[PDB]
């Protein structure tokens, strides 16, 4: 049980770190999405304002 507790502690550490990792990667995806949306919004506004 001492060695099993060692293994359990290491496994729990790595599982927690991977569960943080999924949050980080999802946040990166969201940042790319919102930046693309804002760029499109501002660019179309540029086109129509300068034309008028």
């Amino acid at each position: 049980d001492l060695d099993l507790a060692k293994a359990s502690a290491t496994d729990q550490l790595k599982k927690a770190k991977a569960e943080a990792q999924v949050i980080i990667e999802q946040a990166n995806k969201r940042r790319s999405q919102i930046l693309d949306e804002a760029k499109a919004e501002a660019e179309q506004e540029r086109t129509k304002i300068v034309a008028q």
Binding site: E45, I49, V50
Partner: protein
């Protein structure tokens, strides 16, 4: 966008200014043709030949 519009305004205003300047100077040339004579020619010469 506003910077580009301001630059376009400046450019177009200069373009039209140059067009009307062309017109004005051509009119001045024709006026000279319609007004110059020997007395004016001698007046101009006497202002020139001082130097």
């Amino acid at each position: 966008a506003q910077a580009e519009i301001e630059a376009e305004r400046k450019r177009a205003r200069e373009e039209l200014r140059k067009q009307v300047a062309i017109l004005a100077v051509a009119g001045a040339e024709k006026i000279i043709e319609r007004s110059v004579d020997e007395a004016a020619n001698s007046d101009i010469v006497d202002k020139l030949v001082a130097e």
